[PDB]
Structure formats: structure tokens, C-alpha cells
Design a protein around this ligand. Structure first.
Ligand code: MG
Ligand code: MG
Ligand code: MG
Ligand code: MG
Ligand code: MG
Ligand code: MG
Ligand code: MG
Ligand code: MG
Ligand code: MG
Ligand code: MG
Ligand code: MG
Ligand code: MG
Ligand code: MG
Ligand code: MG
Ligand code: MG
Ligand code: MG
Ligand code: MG
Ligand code: MG
Ligand code: MG
Ligand code: MG
Lengths: 45, 322, 158, 240, 117, 392
RNA sequence: GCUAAACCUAGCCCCAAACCCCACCUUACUACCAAACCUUAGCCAAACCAUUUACAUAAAGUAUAGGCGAUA
RNA sequence: GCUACCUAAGAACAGCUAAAAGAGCACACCCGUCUAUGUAGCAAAAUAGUGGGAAGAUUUAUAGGUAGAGGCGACAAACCUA
RNA sequence: CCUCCGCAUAAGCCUGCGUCAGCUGACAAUUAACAGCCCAAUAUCUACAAUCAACCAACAAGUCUUAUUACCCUCACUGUCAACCCAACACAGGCAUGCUCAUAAGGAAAGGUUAAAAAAAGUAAAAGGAACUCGGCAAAUCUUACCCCGCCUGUUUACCAAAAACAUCACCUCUAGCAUCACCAGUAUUAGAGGCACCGCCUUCCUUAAAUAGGGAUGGCUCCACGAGGGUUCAGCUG
RNA sequence: UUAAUUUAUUAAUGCAAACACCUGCAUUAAAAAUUUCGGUUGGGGCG
């Protein structure tokens, strides 16, 4: 019954975790800054 | 999944490819008040009629030639009805769709879980001739059924895809322009208006001069084959019960200025491999080169009006059933 | 922004407390600027103005830290620039009145080069400096022509 | 939330307007009012509650023809498309308003009391005392705000000086300057009370939904309780 | 779910796939009906010269002598193009020698560059 | 009550920096930076002019500055105006007197069976069936498809009478023709910009139906008025308009005389379809507009009683119901309410068939109504043919 | 005798010194349309917890503070 | 991106019986009454049969909203990525 | 021999049974007409559902722009493969839509053998027919009648409870006289909250052979219909 | 929750303060917030 909580949709993916939304708020900008400091290859989703 | 065969097509050598898809041999040749009316329609749509909105060359076809062709067909049918009683009872259709669906050849599925399995090649023509005339009595033959001609149908070694031609899956329709219940089920003549995308000017700019006649010829072959095939299937023939009498129809294809004339006799609906392995008959399409009805239109005058084009239109409209 | 002890006994609960000034909207006339400003103000500010004997005196006397207002420092810069330039725009067609005002506020006058930078934040000062020192690069054609002419002059002289 | 109110149209029109449902949510996206949601899609017909609105470049009392009386999804009272001069507008239809009727809208406070004919709008000063009224303004020219529901009728209780005392349908008195306009008679659809919803589905069509947790305070709904005083603490709840 | 693969026009739904491109420069615009109007002037015209009679070849004979690289500089170009005329007119208004005060008014403006390659 | 809530109204610009209120100093803004920063003053940018001019980014300068803007407001009637009072308003606007039923002069043209089409009912039934059932692969064609089809097929069926009537060769049905006609009515200047479609043009003007005596007798008839609705209601009140009378064709056009205006209300949705009364009003107005354009072109732009009345017919149909109209414009002195009045014969709500069954209704596995038209009325087609044959 | 066992530098730790072409904020990496600032809290210690505690050297753990207690 | 509720604009509902139905029987579809199996399973809640609804307060695709003492809730302390 | 299967579109995925030579590597491939990517503005416009739309039937009241001014250049760009996606898996699960209603499409339940027990699924069964059992659970077969609870259709503890619990029309009580972000573009026949429960009327015997079972001799009643609710029962049916 | 401690915050009032709005200070509420659940004995009690 459970396990399939991920129902992929690129629109939701980008609107929820994308670069633009991350930069839309100071908290998201700090998310990006933390990923950059850690050296993540993928800063945003 | 079936190939969308477009009568009015930009593809090169589409006439040859459609000849193959149809099993059609193309043959060059053939099997005053009216002039005033023609000039009147031309000048009506070009000069006399006042346009509130500026007419752009991207829409001149639809806003000038289409009303012009409608007026030609309607007025000429009216004037020739006395000289062709059948033309009085004929139904005149404006942009009524013509659908034909047939199977021609087989292919081995190249890839996927169905790889290696035999699949028929299906084709669909969805045409919307600008005008057409439907009668209740079939026209006479242009040549006896089983008429053999030395010319051979072109052979296409490549897949239909290589000619820009794509597959879709949608309703398979067989339609002569009206449902089967319509008594006026046979086809008399079609009038086709080449769209702006296929302008003679654009064709000359991009490719050779022969490609214009190729466009005309392909439109004729496809549209008339679809119409005659739909007529036959309305009469109850199909690939496994081939036509006992040839099914005939005529077409005039124009860009607004240039006109070309085509006669088509469908002798075969047996196009599938099974029904065509030992089928000697072949469909026939007679065609003429495109000729300008007029040379130019300056203000209120039509210069170089060709009477032969109008005579050919009149001859088609005067063709009668027996 | 601080805290208090409920009922002012340390053995009671500790509560967050914000004390805010009572703000008024008042209209002030600046003699040096010959303009009336509507300014949100406090009774303390009104008292300080009274002690200074006028808005202009208050602005010109109170240092940046005591004034603590970007608007106040902009007024200070405007008044100081007006004094340094002795701008005739102060009451035009009334030179006697203009001279009277400038004499009244004479003690605060400073060089214009300094009055230009009064009350500017660090970023504003940086932008001002960048605008001052921005110059579209001179084409090297001009530099090389000047150098060639100079060298040819030297050769002709020698 | 990215909520922008649908009530953005600035120019009055007859055409029904496509109105977006709220679901009882604020612009913040949180539920502010419970029990709202779903229901039949509805279109809003802008109602002109200022009955005395003389046309552009026009003035004085004017008449209007009742083009039709229509059901309004957004009201209990039914509305009337009514046309005058070269304009049409929606108004609240009175009880006996019929298509083809004539309606008079005047701002004239006659010295005598004007014969009060149902449907016409006069300043309260011009009405006989005790006439049934609806679509009453609070201020002159404000626009009708009171006595607007189906079948409702206030009463012009008194007129003294420039002030009239009205009895609102809640049987509460209200003071309004006699220059403020009101329309005579009771609002249409007088049988709105007697309508029986019959089933839960009909309310759900009307956009009312069953909703719980309507209070959001700790412990949910809590009826007020009288806090006893120290002397009465001994007898608050005497054990049996 | 694939965060590392590059975002291309093959990935999103129909709208995404239509909207994103592959870097090809625009050629025209879209009018009503999604009819594309191609602007001729937006199309790069290849100015290909006539190569007939051209003696140069893709390669150079190894017999050619080695030389020292001397990258052209503004000073060198000025000396080789303007200094002669300047001297000849000084011994005997810089536009006469070639300098132009401003690039505006030219078809090929040097800054901001407004020509391809 | 003011429409448009604040939260939806455009937000007020932020208050100007106080630095801009200090006379002597030049504020330091981020204009030099070429980008916003929150710690510098917001520049006051000069309005930009080089835009709002390029095609594809145009603005259409205000109405007052348009060449044809006029202080006197005209009231235009275009194809998409729906008169409140319908036929009464149209009659008042055109200064016309209504007559129920078509004139005998036209109704008699079909009485003799020679004009009757051979297999007339068969052909009409086939036309209806093609329009309403057989038209497309779809089971039930829409009005937008079967209204123009039915009209065109009927017109062809009538044109088939060229056998009996060679005079039918001197006509042609034009499409997308647009006429314009302006005239005054009690100081109100009214225009009709008729676009419609399917204008039947003839090389000869139509014979007049009303005699001199009847035209003069119209004087006694009083033009019905309606209050408090003004005659202008539902007419586009517009200040940008042209007073020129346009017949829709360049000078020298063969077939210059309008014969019939074929108006079709082919909208699929009832709210987008004209009511029968409003359709009849539109027919009256368009016939009047064509006739008035013809009169202004022929007898000049002078308000006068016409010695030779101009006759224009019109058939307005929704694909099933037809309305027949013959309009005789016998006066261009429209300003006054008194004098000879134009006159129109109208036959209303002539339904060619009352219902068409696209599918066979089956109850308890029994076919009750067979597929096809039911209640077909050849009388309406006789009236249609009579109008077509008028003038031939 | 299989699996395995072993290995030594890849680097790292702590100090010192020294102050260190094109594309991309729209769905990022997509050529081109009319707006920041604002007390940390709490764990924890007090054997619970509630005020409180808990974010060079020497003078000196001194003066002081503190449910005058933990402690500071 | 589950789920709860809501917003926008979509879509689906055979046949029979009955007539404009929160109507009957019953497909698709939704659910999950009872039984058996399974219980590191095919499955971190399934399978088979049986059963309830199946034109509605229905089911459902798409996009958007409500966020943690908060949301949402036809209150089961239900749900808010097992 | 088998399949609510199959083919497409959408969404998702992203080369993931094409060729070649040794799972790896190399090589190839999806070609726009389908689809996406639009629109020059200012204003003024736009009461009249849909349901074959014609009657008929309503209520829940239901996607509805021309004039003027600018403007002529034209078919670019992108998706196009597959045996595929979400479930850690070559997962019996989840998975929208259009057509095919048994397939013209798609597939293979048995690796070989033997024929033990126990276990699962199924079929048949003498005589009997509920004696089983907490209970007719399951199965087999047709049915009767009656009680308790809840009026009803609905909702709920995703994953042990589907119910008498929750909601529900109806009714009662309390609060509110009012506009530009919910309530509401509403106004006391309205809105919010709570309670209650459709509605309507008044104030020892029987059953069995045996019966801890069942049925009967504001409040008090009235159960029309409905129910995978909880009990009892005739008849039938049955491993 | 009628356990203890608070009212910071809102809502009311009152007093000052500025001449509807707002600041400070009190009081009363609402809403909450923080924190605690002594020990020994007693199975059919009411300590
Ligand atoms: Mg989902
Ligand atoms: Mg502790
Ligand atoms: Mg059904
Ligand atoms: Mg039902
Ligand atoms: Mg629920
Ligand atoms: Mg509970
Ligand atoms: Mg509980
Ligand atoms: Mg197997
Ligand atoms: Mg085995
Ligand atoms: Mg047995
Ligand atoms: Mg027993
Ligand atoms: Mg029994
Ligand atoms: Mg026993
Ligand atoms: Mg059972
Ligand atoms: Mg129940
Ligand atoms: Mg459960
Ligand atoms: Mg559930
Ligand atoms: Mg359960
Ligand atoms: Mg028992
Ligand atoms: Mg139920």
C-alpha cells in the first residue's frame, strides 16, 4: 500500500525545489550557500 | 499506427511516393459569358471587394483565392446546370472532409517487444477539398478495367519515413464527404486550393521548378485516390472484394493563379500484399501541367486571361454519368 | 528591547518587554533650506530643538551619533553644502536675507569638499567615489599620437 | 499564498462574472471560515444597489423598464435586469416585480408623501410613515446595505427633522438621514424560508460542506463558564 | 529524481519540451496562431569569398623558415599604420589619420562589438 | 459602492526617499550601478520614449488624438449588437412601418407549379439531412457547421432554377462584403457597419413593391415609440467613427445592386445566438443599411423622399428557423418622425423543420422516431425560393 | 593448498609565518519587453523547578552578585 | 509529487429497470464486509473468492494553496512522504 | 493453451533485448504535417445555459469582443527510441485518457521425474441434513418472520475496529445592524457558532425434546424506508 | 483543571501623553506560557 509516495512530475519538482524557488527567499539562498560550502555537485533540484 | 498521407505535401517526389502507396500509374495528358463570369469573380475577390483589414501575403490564399474558388465553382455549376442536368441534382460541398484508410504492404517490426513480427503498413488520407461535387449516378469509365499500360508504378526501396511521413494512431475513417446514408455518394469533381505554405514563390525559392508540378501531381494522386477509394468502399468493395467497375473522379488543383487538371480511375482496392500478390490491375491518374489562368491583375483589369483553363474547368463540369 | 521581572521582584517571572517612543508628526521649517518638512518626531527631539534654538541649529550641532537618523544626516549635509557654497538659491532676489541666514549659521561652515561627504553611509560614499573616478578609457590613439608628437618635437630640437 | 481576490473588475457590467470560490480561506491560504467549499460553479451578476444613479450627463428622477426577473445564485433575493435611457443594470427585485413593469427612481423629497408604489425608490423623507421598505442606505448615496435578503421588509417607523427611524428585519431601530433612498415593498422570493433542503447533497451543491475543528483554540469549542467568587467557591458544585 | 544529468528539452512535459531549446539562435518571432515569421535580417548570411585562383592551402611546406612570434599590439599597429602619415604631416583633427571619436554611426562598431566573429 | 478591491488595485509606489526633499544636494542612487541595491536611493528615471512605437510593441495613442475622433457621439450598430426592444427599436431607428407576411408580388412568384423545383421536397430533405446528420464523420454536427451548410445548399437549390429563369445568370452571392451607412434620427446620428455574409448581388435593381399611394399612406401611420428605454440602447456609442457611406465595393463593380442579405446565426451556444426578435431587428437594420448606402451612392447624399424606392431583401436563419424580410427604403429624410416612412414586410419564425433526430430514439428496444427531419415544412422553402426569384 | 595473510606512501593533523569564448535568478546554466535591518531560545546545573546557571601574567577566585544557593 | 482539506480548469460513469432520482440491479471505476492464503510474503498491508457504492455528499488526471503547538480533520488523536 | 488483454496519447524515465565483436565495448538511431513554443495595443463590448435542444422537465443557475490606430516580413526552434514509470528487485502492488470486447493485438500456468505424509486450491460423495460451532464461519442453496440500534444515501481509525461513532436534511439556542483580501463583492428569509437528530402523535406465557438465547405480557410514544450493523427464527441447502 | 507562577501578547476600560491614531502606566479578562505530581502503609476501599 505504501512506499510509492514519489509520483514524479518535473513541474512540481522544479516549482518546489528549483533554483528559482531556492533564490526566492533568504532561507533558500542560505540552502544554496550551504550546498556550495559543502561542495555539492547539485546545488538545486 | 498508420502513416498520415498528406495530399498537399511539401515532401520532394511525393508524387512518386504516393504513386507507390496507391499503386497508381500517372499518365501525362488526358484519357464567352463564362469568361465574363470568371473575370468577374477574379476582380471581385482581388479589387472590387473592399477589405476593412489589410490583406497580408501570409493570408492571401485563404482570404482571396478560397472565396474566389468558391465563387467560380458555385456560379459555374449554376450556369452549366442547363447543359448538364445531373449537375443540377448534384450536391456541392464546401470544405467537407474526405477520409480514406487503406493497407498497402507489410513491414517487419524493427525493434521493441514486437520485434521481428509482421505488421501491415496502414495509411490514412484526411483531405478537405476546397469544393467538391457529389452525384447519385457514377461517372463513366475513362478506360476499361484491366486496362494495361506499359508505364510501371515507381518502386520505393526505402521506408515511407524517409519521405517525411509520420505515423499516428487515430480514428480510421472512410468518408466521401458525406455519410453512407447520403444518396449522392459518387464523386464528380474536386477543387483544391494549395495553401500558402506551398506557394509557387516559396517552392521556386527553395527547390527546382519541377517541384511545383510535383506538388500538384501529389495532391491530385492522393486526394483523388482517397475519394475514389471511399466511393468504392461505400459501394461495398474492399481489398478482398475488389471493384468490379472502375471508380472515376476528376480534380482541379489551383494555387489561386495556376490550375492543373487531373482524371483518376481507381481499378484496385486490392492493395494489401495478400490481395496484390497476383493483382494485375492498377489505378490510373491522367494529369496536365499547371497553367496560369491569368498573367496578372492590375487594378481593375485581368491581363492574359487564359481561355483554355476555363474551358478545361467547363469540360470537367460538363462530364456526365451515362 | 529588554526584559522585566513581573511585579518588579527578581523572584517572579521574567517577561519580554518592548518600550517604544511616542512618535508625533510635526512640520518643521528650515531657514537654511527655506523648506518645510513634515517629520515623525519625539518629544525628546522637540526639546532638543528648543535647546538648540531651531531645527537648523539642532541639525548642525548634534553629531551623527546623537542625531541617529539618515534623514537628519541628509539634512545636515544639505545645510552644510548650502553654507559652504553660500548658494544664492537661498531666498533668491533677497540677498540681504540670504546673507543674514548665512551669518547666523556661519560658525558651522566647512569646506565644500568636506560638506559633500557628511552623513554618507559607507556604500553611498563608495558609489560617490566610483562615480567621481569613472572615466571612459581614453583611446590609445590619442595617447600614442601625443607620445609620437612629443618624441618628434624632441628629435627636431636635438 | 499567491491569492489575489477575483473581485478585480473595475467597470460595472451586466455580463455574469466568473467568480472564484474561496473555500473559506484567507489570502494567506489558511481556513478562516469553516464549512465552505465546493458547490455548483457560479457567475456573479454585479448588482447596482444605488437605485438612484442618474445616467451620465443626466439628472433628476428617472423611470426604468423591468426587462426581466431572474434567479441569482449569489443571493436569496431574485434580481431584475432593468433598463433605462440607454443603460441596463441589475437591481434587487421586489415581491411583485414583473417583466415589463415600470419603476421610478427619484431623489425628490416632496412636501407631501408620495404615493408609495411597490418597486420604486424614493428618499425616506418622501415615504408615508409605516411603509414597508428594503434596500436601505445607511448614508445618503452610500448604496443599499440593509434589508436585502429574500422576503425582508423594514418599516419606516418615524420621521422627525431630517432623520427617519427604520425598523430593520431584526426588529432593531436605525437612524438614517431622510435624504437616503430606499425602495418600497418587501424583497422578492418571499418563500425562501419555506424551502426544504431535503438532503445533505443539496447543501453540498450550495457550497456548504461539513467541517469540524471550527475553533482552532486549545481544547476546541469551550462554552463560557461563570467563574465563582471566593465566597461561592464552597458551593460551586456541591456533591450529592 | 536525476539531479546530476543535464537539464535538456527532452525531459519535462510537453510544455517544457517545447519551451526549452538547444542553443540555436533565434531567427524570427511568433505571431497569433503560433505562425512563425522568419526575419531575413536575423538569419546569419555566410559571406563566403571566391576561392578561385587562391594560392594558399590548408597546410604549409615544412621548408618554410622558422620565425619568432611577435603578437600584434596597439603600439605596433599605430606605428605601422598611423605613424608614417603623422610624421609626414607634422614635418609639413585626427580623423584625417584614421581616428574616429565615436563608434556610433559605423556598421561595424568596435565597442560594444556588433558584428559576428 | 466602488468596483475593484484595493488588494487587486495596482499597488501605490513606495514613498520617495527623503533625500529628494532636500533642495541643495544631489541624491546618490543606484542608477550608476545599473541595478537595484536596497541601501541606495531609488532613481527617478525619465520616461522612456523609444518604445511603444515599434510594431509588435505598439500603444495606439489615446482616443482623442485619433484622426476620426468626433465630439458628437455616433451610435453604431455592428454584427454583434443585440437590440433590447428588437423589432420595435429597429423600426423606430430606420423610420419603418412593419407589415406581417411577405408581399403578394413575391409570394405569387412560386404559386405557379412551373417555378416549383422538380423533386423539390426530395432535394430539400436531402439538403437538411446532409447539413444536420450526414455532414461529418461526427454523429451530431454542430450549428456552426450545419447553418452555413443548409443556407448554401438551399441557395444552390434555388440557383438550379436557371433552367426556367435565365435572368438568374445576372447575379452572384458574395461573401465577406461589408457596408456602412450613416443617417440622423432626431439629432442622433446612427451608423450601421454591416459585415454579416452572403450578400446576393444582382446586375439589376429590384422592382418596388409599394406603390406611390401606399408610400404616401405611410404618412398617417405613427412610428411606435417606447419609454423609458431610449432607441439608442444596445447600440455601440462611439466617438471614433467615419460618416462616409460605403456600399462595400469599389465603383464599377458588376452586380452593384443588393438583392438579398443572408444573415446566419450559427453560434453553437444559445447565449451567443440572437433571439428571434433581435435577429429580425438585425435583418431590418442591415437591409436598411444596404438600401441606404445604395441610395446615397445613386441619388446623392441628400435627405429627401426617394422617387425610386430601393428594395433590399434579407433572410435571417438559425439553421432551422428562418425569417424573411423585404425592406423598401422610400425616404432618406430620416431626421423627422413625420412624413413618408420606409416599409418592411416581415414573415417571422418560418421553421423549415421543427426537429431533427440525429439518433433513432429507442424505448424498450423499439424505435419510436426514425432518424431524420420531422415536421418538415415546404412552405418556408417556397417563401425562400420566392425571395430568391424576386427580380427574375 | 585454497581462502587469505602481510606491506608504505597517497595523503592528512597540529603549529609558525604570511592577511587570502558562450550560458546561467524564467523551470539556473535559457541570445532579444514597460525589494534587507528587529532581545536567541532551550538542553543543562541547582540532584525536581519556578529567580538564577548555561551562548599574557598578577591583583584574584579578591571586591562584588546570588531561591546570599547552585553558582556567577 | 503520500495523505487531509481547499482553489482553477478538465475527464469518466456499459447494459437493463426506471423516469429528471444523494432511485433499483449490475460492468468499467472506487472501496475494503467476511473467509482462506501469505506473515523476511508477490507485497514494510498483498492474493483469491465474497461483498458495499457505482449520475453522485461520486471517482479521477493536471497545476496551485494551507507547515509543526502549526496545518488539515463528515473527531478516528485521523492525516501531514512507509 | 491462456489474457480486462492489446495499440496509442499523456505523465514519468532517459538509450535501458537495434548491428557488430569480446554483461562489456564500439557503431548506429527518433527527420513534421502530430505536439509544444503564440498573439500590438487602447478602450468599448458581451442578461437570454446544457442536456441530439426542437417540445417536455427544472434547479444546483452553469468558459464567455468588435472600431480605430500600428503592421507584410513567413514555416525557425524543441519532443519523436525502448521490452520503459512509482514501489530497494525482470516486485502477483500503484498507474490518467482514447479506441479494440475478445482480440487482426499480446502472451506461456509444467526445468526432468515420482505420486509418500503434513499443508494450499478445487471437484465428487452413500444415509442424515446444522447433530458442527461462540456464531450456519466456510460451502451449498432457496427462503420466511421478527426484534435492538441508527431515520435514510454518505464518512471514519491508509496498515487489527466500517460500527450503534461522524456527518446528514429537520429543529432549537446563542452572537452580529455591517462593505472593498475570507465571511462577502454577501446584509436578519443573512452570516458565524453550539446542541439535537428525518418525520409524525400525545404530556409468568410462546418458541425447543431440552431455551443463561429470542419474542410477549420537556418527557412518553410512533421504525416509512434503508443497513456487508447486532440478535432470533421457519423452510431449504449443503462434507 | 477552583494545582502553583505570570500577563510578555491581544481585548477592554481607567490615568497620564500627543490634540481618529498612537506611546507609557495600571486594573480586569481572554487566550495562553512555564512547572510539579513527597514518602510509608492499605487487594473487596471511600483511608
Ligand atoms: Mg497523486
Ligand atoms: Mg535540574
Ligand atoms: Mg449507467
Ligand atoms: Mg444510486
Ligand atoms: Mg473526510
Ligand atoms: Mg472520539
Ligand atoms: Mg480515544
Ligand atoms: Mg513456465
Ligand atoms: Mg518442479
Ligand atoms: Mg453426502
Ligand atoms: Mg448446536
Ligand atoms: Mg434449519
Ligand atoms: Mg456441540
Ligand atoms: Mg457465508
Ligand atoms: Mg446509519
Ligand atoms: Mg484499519
Ligand atoms: Mg478509507
Ligand atoms: Mg476492517
Ligand atoms: Mg443457538
Ligand atoms: Mg451505507
Amino acid at each position: 500500500a505504501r512506499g510509492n509516495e514519489y509520483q514524479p512530475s518535473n513541474i512540481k519538482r522544479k516549482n518546489k525545489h528549483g533554483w528559482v524557488r531556492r533564490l526566492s527567499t533568504p532561507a533558500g539562498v542560505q540552502v544554496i550557500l550551504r550546498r556550495m560550502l559543502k561542495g555539492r555537485k547539485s546545488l538545486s533540484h | 499506427m498508420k502513416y498520415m498521407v498528406y495530399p498537399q505535401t511539401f515532401a520532394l517526389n511525393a508524387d512518386r511516393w504516393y504513386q507507390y502507396f496507391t499503386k497508381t500509374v500517372f499518365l501525362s495528358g488526358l484519357p464567352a459569358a463564362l469568361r465574363a463570369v470568371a473575370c468577374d469573380c477574379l476582380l471581385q475577390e482581388h479589387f472590387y471587394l473592399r477589405r476593412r483589414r489589410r490583406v497580408h501575403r501570409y493570408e492571401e490564399s485563404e482570404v482571396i483565392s478560397l472565396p474566389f474558388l468558391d465563387q467560380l465553382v458555385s456560379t459555374l455549376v449554376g450556369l452549366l446546370s442547363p447543359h448538364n442536368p445531373a449537375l443540377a441534382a448534384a450536391a456541392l460541398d464546401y470544405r467537407c472532409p474526405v477520409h480514406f484508410y487503406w493497407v498497402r504492404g507489410e513491414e517487419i517490426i524493427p525493434r521493441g517487444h514486437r520485434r521481428g513480427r509482421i505488421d501491415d503498413l496502414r495509411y490514412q488520407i484526411d483531405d478537405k477539398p476546397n469544393n467538391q461535387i457529389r452525384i447519385s449516378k457514377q461517372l463513366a469509365e475513362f478506360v476499361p478495367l484491366d486496362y494495361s499500360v506499359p508505364i510501371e508504378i515507381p518502386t520505393i526501396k526505402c521506408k515511407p519515413d524517409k519521405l517525411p511521413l509520420f505515423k499516428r494512431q487515430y480514428e480510421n475513417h472512410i468518408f466521401v464527404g458525406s455519410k453512407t446514408a447520403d444518396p449522392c455518394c459518387y464523386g464528380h469533381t474536386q477543387f483544391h486550393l494549395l495553401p500558402d505554405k506551398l506557394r509557387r514563390e516559396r517552392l521556386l525559392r527553395q527547390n527546382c521548378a519541377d517541384q511545383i508540378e510535383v506538388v500538384f501531381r501529389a495532391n491530385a494522386i492522393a486526394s483523388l485516390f482517397a475519394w475514389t477509394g471511399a466511393q468504392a468502399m461505400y459501394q461495398g468493395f474492399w481489398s478482398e472484394a475488389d471493384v468490379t467497375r472502375p471508380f472515376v473522379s476528376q480534380a482541379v488543383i489551383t494555387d489561386g493563379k495556376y490550375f492543373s487538371f487531373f482524371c483518376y480511375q481507381l481499378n484496385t482496392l486490392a492493395l494489401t500484399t495478400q490481395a496484390d500478390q497476383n493483382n494485375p490491375r492498377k489505378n490510373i491518374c491522367w494529369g496536365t501541367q499547371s497553367k496560369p489562368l491569368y498573367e496578372t491583375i492590375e487594378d481593375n483589369d485581368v491581363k492574359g486571361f487564359n481561355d483554355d483553363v476555363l474551358l478545361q474547368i467547363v469540360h470537367f463540369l460538363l462530364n456526365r454519368p451515362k | 528591547l529588554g526584559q522585566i521581572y513581573a511585579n518588579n521582584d527578581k523572584l517572579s517571572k521574567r517577561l519580554k518587554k518592548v518600550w517604544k517612543p511616542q512618535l508625533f508628526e510635526r512640520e518643521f521649517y528650515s531657514e537654511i533650506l527655506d523648506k518645510k518638512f513634515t517629520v515623525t518626531v519625539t518629544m525628546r527631539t522637540l526639546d532638543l530643538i528648543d535647546e538648540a534654538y531651531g531645527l537648523d541649529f539642532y541639525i548642525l550641532k548634534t553629531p551623527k551619533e546623537d542625531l541617529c537618523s539618515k534623514f537628519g544626516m541628509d539634512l545636515k549635509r544639505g545645510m552644510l553644502l548650502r553654507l559652504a557654497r553660500q548658494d544664492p538659491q537661498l531666498h533668491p532676489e533677497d540677498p540681504e536675507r540670504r546673507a543674514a541666514i548665512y551669518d547666523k549659521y556661519k560658525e558651522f561652515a566647512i569646506p565644500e569638499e568636506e560638506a559633500e561627504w557628511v552623513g554618507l553611509t559607507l556604500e553611498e560614499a563608495i558609489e560617490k567615489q566610483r562615480l567621481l573616478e569613472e572615466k571612459d578609457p581614453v583611446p590609445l590613439f590619442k595617447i600614442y599620437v601625443a607620445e609620437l608628437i612629443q618624441q618628434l618635437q624632441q628629435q627636431a630640437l636635438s | 499564498a499567491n491569492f489575489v481576490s477575483w473581485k478585480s473588475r473595475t467597470k460595472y457590467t451586466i455580463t455574469p462574472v466568473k467568480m472564484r470560490k474561496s473555500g473559506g480561506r484567507d489570502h494567506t491560504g489558511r481556513i478562516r471560515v469553516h464549512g465552505i467549499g465546493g458547490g455548483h460553479k457560479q457567475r456573479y451578476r454585479m448588482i447596482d444597489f444605488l437605485r438612484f444613479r442618474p445616467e451620465e450627463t443626466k439628472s433628476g428622477p428617472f423611470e426604468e423598464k423591468v426587462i426581466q426577473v431572474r434567479y441569482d445564485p449569489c443571493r436569496s433575493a431574485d434580481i431584475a435586469l432593468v433598463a433605462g435611457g440607454s443603460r441596463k443594470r441589475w437591481i434587487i427585485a421586489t415581491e411583485n416585480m414583473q417583466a415589463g413593469d415600470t419603476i421610478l427612481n427619484s431623489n425628490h423629497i416632496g412636501r407631501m408623501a408620495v404615493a408609495a408604489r411597490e418597486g420604486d425608490a424614493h428618499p425616506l423623507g418622501a415615504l408615508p410613515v409605516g411603509t414597508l421598505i428594503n434596500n436601505v442606505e445607511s448614508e445618503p448615496g452610500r448604496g443599499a446595505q440593509y434589508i436585502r435578503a429574500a422576503g425582508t421588509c423594514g418599516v419606516l417607523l418615524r420621521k422627525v427633522n431630517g432623520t427617519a427611524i427604520i425598523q430593520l428585519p431584526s426588529k432593531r431601530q436605525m437612524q438614517v438621514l431622510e435624504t437616503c433612498v430606499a425602495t418600497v415593498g418587501r424583497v422578492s422570493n418571499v418563500d425562501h424560508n419555506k424551502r426544504v433542503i431535503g438532503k445533505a447533497g443539496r447543501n453540498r451543491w450550495l457550497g456548504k460542506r461539513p467541517n469540524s475543528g471550527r475553533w482552532h483554540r486549545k481544547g476546541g469549542w469551550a462554552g463560557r463558564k461563570i467563574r465563582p467568587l471566593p465566597p461561592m467557591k464552597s458551593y460551586v458544585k456541591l456533591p450529592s | 529524481a536525476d539531479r546530476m544529468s543535464k537539464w535538456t528539452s527532452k525531459r519535462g512535459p510537453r510544455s517544457f519540451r517545447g519551451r526549452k531549446g538547444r542553443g540555436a539562435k533565434g531567427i524570427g518571432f511568433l505571431t497569433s496562431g503560433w505562425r512563425f515569421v522568419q526575419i531575413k535580417e536575423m538569419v546569419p548570411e555566410f559571406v563566403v569569398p571566391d576561392l578561385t585562383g587562391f594560392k594558399l592551402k590548408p597546410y604549409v611546406s615544412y621548408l618554410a623558415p622558422e620565425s619568432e612570434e611577435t603578437p600584434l599590439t596597439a603600439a605596433q599597429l599605430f606605428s605601422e599604420a598611423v605613424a608614417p602619415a603623422i610624421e609626414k604631416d607634422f614635418k609639413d583633427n585626427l580623423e584625417k589619420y584614421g581616428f574616429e571619436p565615436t563608434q556610433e554611426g559605423k556598421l561595424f562598431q568596435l565597442y560594444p562589438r556588433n558584428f559576428l566573429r | 459602492y466602488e468596483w475593484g478591491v484595493r488588494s487587486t488595485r495596482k499597488s501605490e509606489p513606495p514613498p520617495l526617499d527623503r533625500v529628494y526633499e532636500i533642495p541643495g544636494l544631489e541624491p546618490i542612487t543606484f542608477a550608476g550601478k545599473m541595478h537595484f541595491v536596497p541601501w541606495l536611493a531609488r532613481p527617478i528615471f525619465p520616461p522612456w520614449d523609444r518604445g511603444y512605437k515599434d510594431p509588435r510593441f505598439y500603444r495606439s495613442p489615446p482616443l482623442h488624438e485619433h484622426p476620426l475622433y468626433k465630439d458628437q457621439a455616433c451610435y453604431i450598430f455592428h454584427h454583434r449588437c443585440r437590440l433590447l426592444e428588437g423589432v420595435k427599436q429597429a423600426l423606430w431607428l430606420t423610420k419603418t412601418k412593419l407589415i406581417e407576411g411577405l408581399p403578394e408580388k413575391v409570394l405569387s412568384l412560386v404559386d405557379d407549379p412551373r417555378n416549383h423545383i422538380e423533386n423539390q421536397d426530395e432535394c430539400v430533405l436531402n439538403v437538411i439531412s446532409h447539413a444536420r446528420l450526414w455532414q461529418t464523420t461526427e454523429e451530431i454536427p454542430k450549428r456552426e457547421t450545419y447553418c452555413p451548410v443548409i443556407v448554401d445548399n438551399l441557395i444552390q437549390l434555388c440557383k438550379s432554377q436557371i433552367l426556367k429563369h435565365p435572368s438568374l445568370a445576372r447575379r452572384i452571392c458574395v461573401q465577406n462584403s461589408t457596408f456602412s451607412a450613416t443617417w440622423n434620427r432626431e439629432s442622433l446620428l446612427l451608423q450601421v457597419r454591416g459585415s454579416g455574409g452572403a450578400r446576393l448581388s444582382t446586375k439589376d435593381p429590384l422592382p418596388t413593391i409599394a406603390s406611390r399611394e401606399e408610400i404616401e399612406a405611410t404618412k398617417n401611420h405613427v412610428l411606435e415609440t417606447f419609454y423609458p428605454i431610449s432607441p439608442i440602447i444596445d447600440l455601440h456609442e462611439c466617438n471614433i467613427y467615419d460618416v462616409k457611406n460605403d456600399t462595400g465595393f469599389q465603383e464599377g463593380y458588376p452586380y452593384p445592386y443588393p438583392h438579398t442579405l443572408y444573415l446566419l446565426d450559427k453560434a453553437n451556444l444559445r447565449p451567443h445566438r440572437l433571439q428571434p426578435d433581435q435577429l429580425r431587428a438585425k435583418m431590418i437594420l442591415f437591409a436598411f443599411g444596404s438600401a441606404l448606402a445604395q441610395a446615397r451612392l445613386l441619388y446623392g447624399n441628400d435627405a429627401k423622399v426617394l422617387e425610386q424606392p430601393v428594395v433590399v431583401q434579407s433572410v435571417g436563419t438559425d439553421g432551422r428557423v428562418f425569417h424573411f424580410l423585404v425592406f423598401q427604403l422610400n425616404t432618406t429624410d430620416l431626421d423627422c418622425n413625420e412624413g413618408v416612412k420606409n416599409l418592411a414586410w416581415v414573415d417571422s419564425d418560418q421553421l423549415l423543420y421543427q426537429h431533427f433526430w440525429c439518433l433513432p430514439v429507442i424505448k424498450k428496444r423499439v424505435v419510436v422516431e426514425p432518424v431524420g427531419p420531422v415536421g418538415f415544412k415546404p412552405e418556408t422553402f417556397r417563401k425562400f425560393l420566392a425571395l430568391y426569384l424576386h427580380g427574375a
